[PDB]
Amino acid sequence: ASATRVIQLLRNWASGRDLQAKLQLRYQEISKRTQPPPKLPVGPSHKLSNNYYCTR
């Protein structure tokens, strides 16, 4: 947040707390909009044997 020191002090004193610590506007701390590919595991019924449907 690009607010001057005097404005920061005034808003902090009017609010009664430190506002720069917990800002309601988002900045570079959010995750990137491009992400690596996922791998996405499979479930328990993905066996090649001992996996008859009548038992599950």
Place this chain on the structure above:
Amino acid sequence: NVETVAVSPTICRRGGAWFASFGRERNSGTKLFNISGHVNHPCTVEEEMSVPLKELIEKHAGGVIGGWDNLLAVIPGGSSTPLIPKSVCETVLMDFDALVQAQTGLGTAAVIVMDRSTDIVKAIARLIEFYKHESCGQCTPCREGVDWMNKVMARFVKGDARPAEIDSLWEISKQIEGHTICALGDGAAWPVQGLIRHFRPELEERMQQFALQHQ
């Protein structure tokens, strides 16, 4: 069968008791034996029913190539019967009941012996390919499943598969056996089961070696 019909008149001429004197109970008579594979003297011979396998090989076939210690496996009753390793081959008799207790069956008494210088997976896969080429295609379990077994077996020889599949293959064979019209499906399922049961470490080692070689 030809042998049954051809022995009936001698049984009539000489008596049922004379024929029944040979072999154990419920295993009477004299049976023709074919010895082939890794023996010094492959031959066809007539001999008493309940002969030991080792005795038969060492007496009539001249022994297994490279001595008895060189034996790896035997298919005792034709390709349909499952194979048995040396440990059980040492003291097994040649008749229906004794060979059933060894989880094989007497079959047609066609002994095919293999020493330790042959690829057991390749031999079983060749038998499965024979069965794939011989099925009539009438019923779906034999047709489809024997083709599937053939494809899986070819990969197994290479070692291109994974360890988890072996169990898969075992399950597939079970599905075929007892569900087909005739016993060709059983005769294709049993050799695979015998190979798995007695040589799973060889399949696992081949798969591991392939995986190491291919990264």
